[PDB]
């Protein structure tokens, strides 16, 4: 097996879990970056936490029978070689497009990470190590990690880590950043872009800037699922965009449920995809979304990793630590010349457990009273803060 | 035994009846202004209407078991004292915040008002009387009332009285307005505000600006209702904002039914509110709503006041007059530095109107035809006139 | 019968069929221009296509019993007379307004248009022919047609034909344009215009410039439908704008379902319309829309026309063709002095069969894959591609 297939299967399982909490909303995430950071953690996880992460990341399909566990480092020889060669394939330079993947881990000065684990991080993901004091200055370390992410994403992802996400309890933060900017194989003419209505539902429609071009494009029409897939290649044909468009507005739902790595392999088969003379209408796209994947990872069977029984002894034998916050951010912009996209996956670990915080992230009742008169000046039921 | 507690009780009694007409919708109103204006009308009511208003406003508990009619003015000595001292309390001048309560009554020049009732209006509510001709220039009187209310709300509540609210047959209007601009005790840093999802339902979410700060705040954890209340004091601690947030979204409904003056007094007890170091997240709020309380006040028990059996001898002894329209507007804006809030309550008497205008202030279809040929050149449906 | 009545009935049928896909959205379209272009095409059809077009255009009512087809050129004498006299009616010079109806057809050089059909176009629609090379320079043809449309609409409708509409397959294009600039019978004083809230819904409202004037106006009040109609005549009383408005906002929906040519005839009756002293508030309006009426016309009953079985023998004796696209655009601006309005309707005839586009106009699943690694760099669902 390959780790690209693990990324695919994880992508679609995670999408099935994610869509249930974001109905009628835009979704965007990077399977590769999430899988890469989660494998960084998977190397350190041992015993039941490691097997859980292995089944969730689908790295169990990668290892051949025999020579598992710390055959080379952290994981088996198969997963090790797969990780290394994928890092090499992604980081290969190209004059046509720009594509970068960087990994960095920040650690507390007091908390000592295993030198073997740091060396394996340098070997597999060639990620650097910085030592910052979280206990004394957590917010400054947050700002530094955020500036590193911002510069690694060419300023696309600013202020990745939310305020208050890290606190003096956090003792290590594993983060990565993927950035891609390319050009279309067949570009869209700037003059051909005009205003076109876009049907959000059958009832309502909103105007958007639609780019148009006519040419030979790979289209695969799946009638069993009532949907067509269009491939728009980029410069050099090493990266491609796939648009899975259901024939009708009502069909998309069905598609979301039936999509899978197996089904996708059938649909994107080189035989199934047909170069035809097509008129292509593609809208200007700008999608930015940031998620907290802790609940999603737990719902997928990664319960031990966030539990106080997490065995991450492969990272640091001194004391014990566990993961508490896994943040992900994704940005994608499609325009006429090409597209610019950028993602980041952050992970912070710590032994401590905050009992409570007071976060107003769902509807409530608010009350404003005059304390001397003990009278209610204002009372309200807030469902949406801003209409 | 105080008008503040009466305002609390009437607040929740009115919330329970108002919530049925605004499902899945923001709610906001000011109990202090509503009960001030209802006491304004209560002073004039006598016999059955006055007892109804006293029970619904909960001024019966304010008066001790002693003389309650004709004493001081209109009501008992106890209610008179409570009115006067709350009026003095919230109109207290403070350099820290701005809090203003204003009352004013408009009357037809042909309509006669008793001098003792006007002297009482100046005594307790310190409000002025303005004589305008409702029968001749009802629209002009409406615009004048809205301009006065706008100036008293510092431009926040503009065009308060809807068109057709006031009528030429209307005898006497009673209005009041509260404005409060204050700053937080512990402010929110502008840089700490970031975009965060807000979960309207379990499956739906929308992004909002969320201000964060870590500090010592007063929180009470009511486990019986599975809910937590947080207090944010303003400058000098004379006013504070209470956020009642259920632990889960679906619990909100339950809370809205179980909340009451007694339960609010239980939950916000000094022993229950504990000072704790909390991470606090609060969304940018801009909640603005206008209501017609006539139906709700009738449902609450004030049936005679809106019916032709309304006796208002203390208001106008020459001829009887009944109220038929009660409007109420409330606006609340929460930001990082502080908050700005403003409310108004409007009262109308003896209303009826027919035609007189063709005002196009709501969506409509339009037709443009060629009269010689009787052909439709243009047809359309206008919701937004300008884009 | 009269083609004005046909335009009215078709207008309301089309409104019924069109409003279903445009809820909470502005609508505007020209019945006269659409019915004129469709009558142009209707002269060229025979057999079932012609009868279908006649039913949808309601020209079957114009023809008196007897001498229905080929009596005049392509149609009955009654329909021919109606067409010619209507052209003369709305293209009548006047010093009070500017009203123009222009029609023009572009054809491929290799396409052999029947000369008698061209003579009919010149007789009944005053339509000139231009020969353009679609197969060798379709984009130049589109630019020329857009420039002609723009000049005929006095610069209101620019870039009328969207890219991709025309292509080397299109063989003929019929386009007409209506323009009308006029002044009110009773003008709006600029000083009387003030900023007034426009109530889109009951609780949310956006501010709009509102002109005011008082005087004698023709208003009809229909209580059975809970709505009033106001007639604002333009200069010289030859064109008038009708504004029908429900008393409550919620009534509007009902109105849109119950409006009809017969009900409109009832409501705009001379005895129903009454001159009365009225205050008139009317907002500034700038309403522009553009539609593709292929689906709407097919749903009304023009199935054979857009199918490969379309008989357009009256246009070309050889190489029979069929319509592919029917684009329409409308613009209206109402201000104090008067009004400026303009529409265009263009239909392009072609010959195709299988689906020839990959139009991305509804939410879709997109993914960006690294082909060497076969890993998904990005995956997402988008419902709206802009924020």
B259: nearest CA partner in chain A: A365
The two three-digit tokens of residue C232, written as one number: 């604002």
For residue A133, the distance in angstroms to the closest alpha carbon of chain C comes to 33
Q: Which residues of A touch C369 (CB under 8 A)?
A: 239-240, 242
Q: Quick check: B274 contacting A, CB < 8 Å?
A: no
Distance CA C347, CA C294 (A): 9
- The CATH class that applies to domain B190-285 reads mainly beta
Nearest CA-CA partner of C322 in C314, C330, C311? C311
Is residue A97 within 8 A of residue A235, CB to CB? The reply is yes
Task: Return the percent helix, strand and coil in chain B, to nearest 5.
Answer: 30, 35, 35
The two three-digit tokens of residue A68, written as one number: 């598992």
Distance CA A335, CA A341 (A): 11
User: Which DSSP helix (H) or strand (E) runs through A138?
Assistant: helix A138-152
The two three-digit tokens of residue B334, written as one number: 């929460």
Distance CA B304, CA B314 (A): 15
Q: Which residues of A touch C366 (CB under 8 A)?
A: 241-244, 285
Neighbours of B24 (CB within 10 A): 9
Task: Return the percent helix, strand and coil in chain C, to nearest 5.
Answer: 30, 35, 35
* Interchain CB distance below 8 Å, A368 and B241: yes
Q: Which residue has the tokens 């996209």?
A: A341
Is residue B281 within 8 A of residue B210, CB to CB? The reply is yes
The two three-digit tokens of residue A89, written as one number: 């394939």
> Which of the residues C177, C219, C282, C336 would you substitute to probe the B interface, choosing the one with the greatest number of B C-beta atoms within 10 Å?
C282
Backbone φ/ψ region at A222: left (φ over 0), alpha (ψ -120 to 50), beta: beta
Is residue B251 within 8 A of residue A353, CB to CB? The reply is no
Nearest CA-CA partner of A285 in A209, A195, A212? A209
Which segments of A154-202 are extended strands (E)? 172-183, 194-198
Q: Which residue has the tokens 């929308």?
A: B206
Is residue A3 within 8 A of residue A79, CB to CB? The reply is yes
Is residue B249 within 8 A of residue B199, CB to CB? The reply is yes
DSSP state letters, A73-110: SSS-HHHHHHHHHHHHHHT---SSSEEEEEEEEEE-SS
The two three-digit tokens of residue A319, written as one number: 């004391």
Neighbours of C241 (CB within 10 A): 23
For residue B238, the distance in angstroms to the closest alpha carbon of chain C comes to 32
Backbone φ/ψ region at C30: left (φ over 0), alpha (ψ -120 to 50), beta: beta
Distance CA C5, CA C59 (A): 10
* Whole-Å CA distances, B53 to A370, B36, B38, B304, B328: 24, 12, 8, 9, 18
Q: Is B121 helix (H, G, I), strand (E, B) or coil?
A: helix
Q: Quick check: B25 contacting C, CB < 8 Å?
A: yes
Cα dihedral A102/A108/A114/A120 (nearest 10): 0
Distance CA C299, CA A223 (A): 24
* Interchain CB distance below 8 Å, B364 and C283: no
Q: Is B287 helix (H, G, I), strand (E, B) or coil?
A: strand
Distance CA C381, CA C366 (A): 6
Q: Going by DSSP bridges, is the β-strand pair B98-107/B128-131 parallel, antiparallel, or unpaired?
A: parallel
Torsion sign, CA atoms C41, C45, C48, C49: negative
Distance CA C162, CA C146 (A): 9
Task: Return the percent helix, strand and coil in chain A, to nearest 5.
Answer: 30, 35, 40
Backbone φ/ψ region at A127: left (φ over 0), alpha (ψ -120 to 50), beta: beta
The two three-digit tokens of residue C352, written as one number: 């195709």
Distance CA A35, CA A57 (A): 7
Distance CA B383, CA C4 (A): 27
**DSSP character at residue B189:** P
Is residue B42 within 8 A of residue B60, CB to CB? The reply is no
The two three-digit tokens of residue B165, written as one number: 């609210």
N- to C-terminal Cα separation, chain B: 55
Q: Which residue has the tokens 């006065």?
A: B148
Q: Going by DSSP bridges, is the β-strand pair B274-283/B206-222 parallel, antiparallel, or unpaired?
A: antiparallel
For residue B87, the distance in angstroms to the closest alpha carbon of chain C comes to 31
Technique used by the depositors: X-ray
Radius of gyration (Cα) for chain B, nearest Å? Answer: 24
Distance CA C67, CA C59 (A): 14
Distance CA A184, CA C133 (A): 30
Nearest CA-CA partner of B192 in B281, B88, B85, B81? B281
Is residue A319 within 8 A of residue A110, CB to CB? The reply is no
Backbone φ/ψ region at B223: left (φ over 0), alpha (ψ -120 to 50), beta: alpha
**DSSP character at residue A232:** E
Q: Is C128 helix (H, G, I), strand (E, B) or coil?
A: strand
> Which of the residues C352, C377, C384 would you substitute to probe the A interface, choosing the one with the greatest number of A C-beta atoms within 10 Å?
C377
* Interchain CB distance below 8 Å, A358 and B5: no
Nearest CA-CA partner of B174 in B105, B102, B98, B76? B105
Distance CA A360, CA B199 (A): 10
Question: After which residues are there C–N gaps above 2.5 Å in chain A?
Answer: none
Distance CA B366, CA B383 (A): 11
Q: Which residues of A touch B90 (CB under 8 A)?
A: 370, 372-373, 375
Q: Is A65 helix (H, G, I), strand (E, B) or coil?
A: coil
Which residues, at least 6 apart from A223, have a Cβ–Cβ distance to it below 8 Å?
none
Q: Which residue has the tokens 């606006």?
A: B331
* Whole-Å CA distances, B67 to B41, B43, B77: 20, 15, 8
Angle (CA) C361 C365 C368, round 5°? 115
Which residues, at least 6 apart from C292, have a Cβ–Cβ distance to it below 8 Å?
C325, C326, C327, C328
Nearest CA-CA partner of C287 in C24, C16, C15, C25? C25
Q: Is C114 helix (H, G, I), strand (E, B) or coil?
A: coil
For residue C108, the distance in angstroms to the closest alpha carbon of chain B comes to 31
Chain-centroid distance, C-alpha A176: 10
Would you tell me which residues 108-147 of chain B have a C-beta closer than 8 angstroms to some C-beta of chain C? 139
Q: Which residue has the tokens 């705009």?
A: C268
Burial C244-269 (b: 16+ CB within 10 A, else e): bbbeebeebeebbeebebeebeebbe
Is residue C253 within 8 A of residue C317, CB to CB? The reply is no
Partners of C132 in the β-ladder: C108
Backbone φ/ψ region at A164: left (φ over 0), alpha (ψ -120 to 50), beta: left
Neighbours of C337 (CB within 10 A): 11
Is residue B105 within 8 A of residue B125, CB to CB? The reply is no
* Interchain CB distance below 8 Å, A26 and C167: no
Instruction: Classify residue B223 as exposed, middle or buried by CB count within 10 Å of its CB (0-12, 13-18, 19+).
Output: exposed
The two three-digit tokens of residue A125, written as one number: 């993901």
Resolution (A): 3.3
Which segments of chain B are extended strands (E)? 27-29, 98-107, 128-131, 172-183, 194-198, 206-222, 227-233, 239-246, 274-283, 285-292, 323-334, 338-349, 357-359, 364-370, 375-382
* Whole-Å CA distances, A298 to A33, A48, A120, B44, B296: 18, 14, 26, 65, 47
Which residues, at least 6 apart from C355, have a Cβ–Cβ distance to it below 8 Å?
none
Distance CA B65, CA B73 (A): 17
Distance CA C301, CA C304 (A): 8
Distance CA C334, CA C324 (A): 34
Distance CA A12, CA A34 (A): 13
Altogether, the residues listed in chain C come to a count of 387
> Which of the residues A26, A167, A376, A387 would you substitute to probe the B interface, choosing the one with the greatest number of B C-beta atoms within 10 Å?
A376
Which residues, at least 6 apart from A70, have a Cβ–Cβ distance to it below 8 Å?
none
Distance CA B31, CA B6 (A): 9
Instruction: Classify residue B371 as exposed, middle or buried by CB count within 10 Å of its CB (0-12, 13-18, 19+).
Output: middle
Q: Quick check: C202 contacting A, CB < 8 Å?
A: no
For residue C254, the distance in angstroms to the closest alpha carbon of chain A comes to 17
Would you tell me which residues 206-245 of chain A have a C-beta closer than 8 angstroms to some C-beta of chain C? 206, 208-210, 212, 214, 217, 219, 228, 230, 237-245
Burial C33-58 (b: 16+ CB within 10 A, else e): bbbbbbbbbbbbbeeebbebbbebbb
Distance CA A37, CA A103 (A): 8
> Which of the residues C160, C165, C375 would you substitute to probe the A interface, choosing the one with the greatest number of A C-beta atoms within 10 Å?
C375
Which among A23, A372, A374 has the least Cβ separation from residue B204?
Answer: A23
Q: Is A366 helix (H, G, I), strand (E, B) or coil?
A: strand
**DSSP character at residue B334:** E
The secondary structure of B9-43, three-state, reads HHHHHHHHHHHHHCCCCCEEECHHHHHHHHHHHHH
Output A291-295 pairs: Cβ under 8 A, ≥24 positions apart: A291/A18, A291/A29, A291/A327, A291/A328, A291/A329, A292/A325, A292/A326, A292/A327, A292/A328, A293/A14, A293/A34, A293/A326, A293/A327, A293/A328, A294/A324, A294/A325, A294/A326
Distance CA A110, CA A108 (A): 5
């Amino acid at each position: 097996g390959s780790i690209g297939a693990a990324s695919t299967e994880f992508c679609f399982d995670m999408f099935k879990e994610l869509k249930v909490h974001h109905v009628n909303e835009n979704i965007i995430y990077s399977p590769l970056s999430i899988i890469s950071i989660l494998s960084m953690v998977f190397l350190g996880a041992r015993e039941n936490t490691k097997t859980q992460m292995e089944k969730v990341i689908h790295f169990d399909k990668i290892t051949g029978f025999g020579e598992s566990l710390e055959s080379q480092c952290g994981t088996s020889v198969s997963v090790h070689a797969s990780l290394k060669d994928i890092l090499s394939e992604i980081t290969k330079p190209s004059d046509n497009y720009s594509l970068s993947l960087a990994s960095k881990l920040y650690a507390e000065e007091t908390y000592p990470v295993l030198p073997e684990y740091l060396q394996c991080i340098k070997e597999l993901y060639k990620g650097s190590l910085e030592t910052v004091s979280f206990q004394t200055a957590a917010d400054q370390a947050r700002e530094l990690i955020n500036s590193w992410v911002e510069t690694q994403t060419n300023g696309v992802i600013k202020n990745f880590l939310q305020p208050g996400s890290v606190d003096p309890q956090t003792e290590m933060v594993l983060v990565d950043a993927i950035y891609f900017k390319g050009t279309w194989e067949k570009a869209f003419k700037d003059e051909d872009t005009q205003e076109v209505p876009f049907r959000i539902t059958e009832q309502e429609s909103k105007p958007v800037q639609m780019m148009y071009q006519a040419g030979s494009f790979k289209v695969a029409t799946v009638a069993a699922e009532k949907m067509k897939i269009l491939e728009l290649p980029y410069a050099s044909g090493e990266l491609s965009m796939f648009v899975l468009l259901p024939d009708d507005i009502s069909g998309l739902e069905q598609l979301e449920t039936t999509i899978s790595i197996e089904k996708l392999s059938e649909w994107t088969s080189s035989n199934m995809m047909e170069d035809r003379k097509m008129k292509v209408y593609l809208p200007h796209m700008k999608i930015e979304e940031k998620y907290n994947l802790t609940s999603v990872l737990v719902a997928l069977g990664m319960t031990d990793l966030f539990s106080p029984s997490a065995n991450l002894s492969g990272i640091s034998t001194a004391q014990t630590l566990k993961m508490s916050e896994a943040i992900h951010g994704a940005y994608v912009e499609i325009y006429e010349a090409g597209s610019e996209m950028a993602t980041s996956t952050g992970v912070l670990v710590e032994a401590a457990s905050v009992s409570e915080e007071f976060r107003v992230d769902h509807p409530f009742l608010f009350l404003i009273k005059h304390n001397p008169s003990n009278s209610i000046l204002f009372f309200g039921r807030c469902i949406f803060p801003h209409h």
